[PDB]
Amino acid sequence: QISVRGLAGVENVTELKKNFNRHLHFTLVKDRNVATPRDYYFALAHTVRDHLVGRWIRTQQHYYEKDPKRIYYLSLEFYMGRTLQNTMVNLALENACDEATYQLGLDMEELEEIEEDAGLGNGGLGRLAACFLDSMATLGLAAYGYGIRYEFGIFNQKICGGWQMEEADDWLRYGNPWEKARPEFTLPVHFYGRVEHTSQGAKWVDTQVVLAMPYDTPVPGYRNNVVNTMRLWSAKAPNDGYIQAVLDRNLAENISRVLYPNDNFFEGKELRLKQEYFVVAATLQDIIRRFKSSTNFDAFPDKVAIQLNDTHPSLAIPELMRVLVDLERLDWDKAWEVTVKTCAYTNHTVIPEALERWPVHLLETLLPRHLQIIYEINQRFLNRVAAAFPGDVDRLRRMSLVEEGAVKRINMAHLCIAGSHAVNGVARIHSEILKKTIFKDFYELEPHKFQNKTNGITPRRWLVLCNPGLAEIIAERIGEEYISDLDQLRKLLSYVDDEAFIRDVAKVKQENKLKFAAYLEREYKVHINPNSLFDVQVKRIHEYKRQLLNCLHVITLYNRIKKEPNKFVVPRTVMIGGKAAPGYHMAKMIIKLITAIGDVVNHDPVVGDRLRVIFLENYRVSLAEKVIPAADLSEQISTAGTEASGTGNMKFMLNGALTIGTMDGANVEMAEEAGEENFFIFGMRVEDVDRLDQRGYNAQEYYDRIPELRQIIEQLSSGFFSPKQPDLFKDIVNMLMHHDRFKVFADYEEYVKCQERVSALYKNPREWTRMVIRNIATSGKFSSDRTIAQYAREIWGVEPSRQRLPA
Amino acid sequence: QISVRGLAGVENVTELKKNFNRHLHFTLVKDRNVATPRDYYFALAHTVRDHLVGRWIRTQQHYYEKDPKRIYYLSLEFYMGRTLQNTMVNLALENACDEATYQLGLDMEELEEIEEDAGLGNGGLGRLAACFLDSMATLGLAAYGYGIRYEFGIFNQKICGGWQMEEADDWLRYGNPWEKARPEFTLPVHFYGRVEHTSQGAKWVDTQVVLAMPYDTPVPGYRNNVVNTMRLWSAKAPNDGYIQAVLDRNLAENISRVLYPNDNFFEGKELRLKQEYFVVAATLQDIIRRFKSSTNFDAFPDKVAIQLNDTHPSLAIPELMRVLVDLERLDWDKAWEVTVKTCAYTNHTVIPEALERWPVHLLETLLPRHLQIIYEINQRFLNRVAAAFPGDVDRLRRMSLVEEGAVKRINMAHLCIAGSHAVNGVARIHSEILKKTIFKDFYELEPHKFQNKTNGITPRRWLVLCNPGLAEIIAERIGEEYISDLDQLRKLLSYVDDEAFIRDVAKVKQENKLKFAAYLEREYKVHINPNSLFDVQVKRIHEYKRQLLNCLHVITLYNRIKKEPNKFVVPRTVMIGGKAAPGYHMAKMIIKLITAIGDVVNHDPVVGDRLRVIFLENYRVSLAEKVIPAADLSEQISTAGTEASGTGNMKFMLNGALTIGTMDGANVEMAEEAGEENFFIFGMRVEDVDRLDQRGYNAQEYYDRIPELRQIIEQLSSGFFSPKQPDLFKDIVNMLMHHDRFKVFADYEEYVKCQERVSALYKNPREWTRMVIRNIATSGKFSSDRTIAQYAREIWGVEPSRQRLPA
Ligand SMILES: O=C(NC(=O)c1cccc2ccccc12)N[C@@H]1O[C@H](CO)[C@@H](O)[C@H](O)[C@H]1O
Ligand SMILES: O=C(NC(=O)c1cccc2ccccc12)N[C@@H]1O[C@H](CO)[C@@H](O)[C@H](O)[C@H]1O
Ligand SMILES: O=c1[nH]cnc2c1ncn2[C@@H]1O[C@H](COP(=O)(O)O)[C@@H](O)[C@H]1O
Ligand SMILES: O=c1[nH]cnc2c1ncn2[C@@H]1O[C@H](COP(=O)(O)O)[C@@H](O)[C@H]1O
Ligand SMILES: *Cc1c(COP(=O)(O)O)cnc(C)c1O
Ligand SMILES: *Cc1c(COP(=O)(O)O)cnc(C)c1O
Tell me the CATH number at A507.
Answer: 3.40.50.2000
Catalytic residue among B5, B430, B460, B545: B545
Do residues B651 and B540 share a domain? yes
Are residues B94 and B117 part of one domain? Answer: yes
- Closest chain A C-alpha to B148 CA, distance in angstroms: 16
CA of A335: how far to CAs of A113, A317, A322, A671, in Å?
50, 11, 9, 45
Cα→Cα distances B749→A548, B552, B753, B754, Å: 94, 10, 6, 9
Neighbours of A391 (CB within 10 A): 8
Is B261 in contact with A242 (Cβ distance < 8 A)?
A: yes
Helix A707-718, helix A730-738: angle, nearest 10: 140
Angle between helices A94-103 and A37-66 (to 10 degrees): 150
**A707 Cβ contact partners less than 8 Å away, ≥ 6 residues apart:** none
How many angstroms separate the CA atoms of A450 and A470, rounded?
38
CA angle, A7 then A13 then A16, to 5°: 120
A30's CB contacts (< 8 A; 6+ apart) are A24, A39, B57
Gaps in chain A (C to N over 2.5 angstroms) fall after 240, 294
* A266 and A400 inside one domain: yes
Kindly state the DSSP code that residue B25 receives in the 8-state scheme: I
DSSP characters for A574-609?
EEEE----TT-HHHHHHHHHHHHHHHHHTT-TTTTT
Residue B122 to residue B127: CA distance in whole angstroms: 8
Integer Cα distance of A688 and B104 in angstroms: 76
Q: Which amino acid is at B262?
A: N
Residue B38 with chain A: CB contacts under 8 Å: 184
A168 contacts A187 by C-beta, under 8 angstroms: no
Ligand 6: distance of its center to the CA of B486 in Å? 20
From CA B607, how far away is CA B618, in angstroms rounded?
27
Give the closest residue to B96 by CA, choosing from B108, B86, B112, B110.
Answer: B108
Residue nearest atom 11 of ligand 6, based on CA coordinates? B123
Same structural domain for residues A674 and A799?
Answer: no
Query: By the 8 A CB rule, do B629 and B519 touch?
Result: no
Beta bridge partners of A214: A233
Region of residue A71 (left: phi > 0; alpha: psi -120 to 50; beta: else): beta
In B398-463 the beta strands, taken as DSSP E runs, fall at: 402-403, 409-411, 422-425, 450-452
B-chain residue closest to A172, CA distance? B183
On the CB side of B199, CA atoms within 13 Å amount to 0
Instruction: Using CA atoms of A260, A274, B234, B313 in order, give the dihedral in degrees to the nearest 10.
Output: -120
Q: Of B647, B659, B662, B787, which one is the catalytic site residue?
A: B647
A127 CA to middle of ligand 5, Å? 7
Of the candidates A225, A746, A276, A776, the residue with the CA atom closest to the CA atom of residue A501? A776
* Ramachandran angles phi, psi of A197, nearest 5°: -100, 110
Distance between CA atoms of B261 and B583, rounded to whole angstroms?
9
Q: Alpha-carbon dihedral of residues B473, B474, B475, B481, nearest 10 degrees?
A: -160
Looking at the structure, tell me whether residues A537 and A440 fall in a common domain.
no
Q: How far apart are CA B86 and CA B464, in angstroms?
A: 9
SS3 category, A545: coil
DSSP string, A323-344: IIIIIS---HHHHHHHHHHHEE
Pairing of strands B422-425, B343-346: parallel
3-state SS assignment for residue A119: strand
Residue A783 CA to its chain's centroid (Å) = 14
Helix (H) or strand (E) holding B307: strand B304-309
SS3 A645: coil
Residue B659 near residue B649 (C-beta atoms within 8 A): yes
Q: Do residues B533 and B612 lie in contact, with contact meaning Cβ atoms separated by under 8 Å?
A: no
| Nearest atom of ligand 6 to the alpha carbon of B81 | 13
Which residue of A242, A255, A293 is the best one to mutate when testing the B interface, meaning the one whose CB has the most B CBs within 10 A?
A: A242
A290 is in an annotated binding site: yes
Among protein residues, the one whose CA lies closest to atom 20 of ligand 4: B61
Residue nearest to atom 7 of ligand 6 (CA): B648
Give one DSSP letter per residue of B95-125, joined into a string. HHHHHHHHHTT--HHHHHTTSPPEEES-SHH
Q: What is the Cα–Cα distance from A65 to A293, expressed in whole angstroms?
A: 11
**CB within 8 Å: A258 and B243:** yes
Please provide the DSSP assignment of A500-520 as one string: HHHHHHHHHHHHHHHHHHHHH
The answer on A382 and A348 residing in a single domain is yes
Annotated binding residue B291: yes
Spatial separation of the C-alpha atoms in residues A217 and A84, rounded to whole Å: 13
Q: Which atom of ligand 3 is nearest to the CA of A289?
A: 18
At B495, give phi and psi (nearest 5°).
-115, 10
CB contact under 8 A, A582 and B242: yes
Q: Which amino acid is at A57?
A: I
Tell whether A546 and A629 lie within a shared domain. Answer: yes
As to burial, measured by CB atoms within 10 angstroms (0-12 exposed, 13-18 middle, 19+ buried), residue A723 is: exposed
Q: d(Cα A646, Cα A552) in Å, to the nearest integer?
A: 22
Query: Crossing angle, helix A468-478 and helix A499-523, to 10 degrees?
Result: 160
Closest CA to A401 of A356, A353, A345, A452: A356
> N- to C-terminal Cα distance for chain A?
26
Q: How many CA atoms does the CB half-sphere of A455 hold within 13 Å?
A: 32
Listed in sequence order, the residues at least 6 apart from A748 whose beta carbon sits closer than 8 Å to its beta carbon are A549, A552, A702, A706, A709
CB B318 within 8 A of CB B373: yes
Same-domain status, B566 and B579: yes
Distances (CA, A) of B423 to A684, B71, B343, B413, B415: 86, 16, 9, 10, 11
What is the C-alpha separation between B247 and B225, in angstroms, rounded? Answer: 45
- Residues B29 and B18: their CA atoms lie apart, in Å, by 15
Among the listed residues B478, B543, B471, the one whose alpha carbon sits nearest the alpha carbon of residue B740: B543
Rounded to whole angstroms, the Cα distance separating A683 from A689 reads 10
Produce one character per residue of A103-113: b if its CB has 16 or more CB atoms within 10 Å, e if not. ebebebeebbe
Residue A793 identity (one-letter amino acid): R
Instruction: Give the CA distances from residue A139 to residues A75, A132, A788, B650, in Å, rounded to whole numbers and listed in that order.
Output: 20, 10, 8, 67
Q: Is B56 within 8 Å of A29 when comparing Cβ atoms?
A: yes
B165 to chain A: closest CA residue: A240
DSSP A783: B
**Nearest residue, CB atoms, B239 vs list A30, A33, A167:** A167
Q: Does residue B348 carry a catalytic annotation?
A: yes
Assess contact for A546 and A684: CB atoms under 8 A. Answer: no
Q: Which of B61, B168, B271 sits opposite A239 (nearest CB)?
A: B168
Q: Is B525 labelled as part of a ligand binding site? A: no
User: Rounded to whole angstroms, how far apart are CA atoms B785 and A485?
Assistant: 71
Q: Are B350 and B477 members of one domain? A: no
Q: How far apart are CA A348 and CA A540, in angstroms?
A: 15
Cα R_g (chain A), whole angstroms? 27
For residue B305, report the phi and psi dihedrals to the nearest 5 degrees.
Answer: -125, 135
Contact A398, A441 (CB under 8 A): yes
Among the listed residues A635, A628, A607, the one whose alpha carbon sits nearest the alpha carbon of residue A599: A607
Which residues make beta-bridge pairs with A143?
A71
- Residue B661 has φ and ψ, to the nearest 5°, of -165, 165
Number of domains in chain B: 2
A156 DSSP β-pair partners: A167
Say if CB A805 and CB A225 are below 8 A apart: yes
Tell whether B577 and B617 lie within a shared domain.
yes
Q: Which residues of B touch A53 (CB under 8 A)?
A: 25-26, 29
Query: CB count, 10 Å around CB of A694?
Result: 7
**How far is Cα A429 from Cα A417, in angstroms, rounded to an integer?**
19
CA-based nearest residue in chain B for residue A256 = B247
Interface test with A, best of B21, B26, B229, B240 (most A CBs within 10 A): B26
Alpha-carbon Rg for chain B in angstroms: 27
Helix segments in B255-312, DSSP class H: 270-292, 300-303
The whole-angstrom separation of Cα A213 and Cα A179 is 13
Q: φ, ψ for residue B167 (rounded to 5)?
A: -130, 140
| Residue A725: domain span | 457-783
Same domain for A697 and A773, yes or no, is: yes
B457 lines ligand 2 (CB under 6 A): no
Residue at B470: amino acid letter = L
| A279 and A339 co-located in one domain | yes
Please say whether the beta carbons of B218 and B52 come within 8 A.
Answer: yes
Stated as kind and residue range, the H or E segment containing A772 is helix A765-777
Return the half-sphere exposure (C-beta side, CA atoms, 13 A cut-off) of residue B359: 12
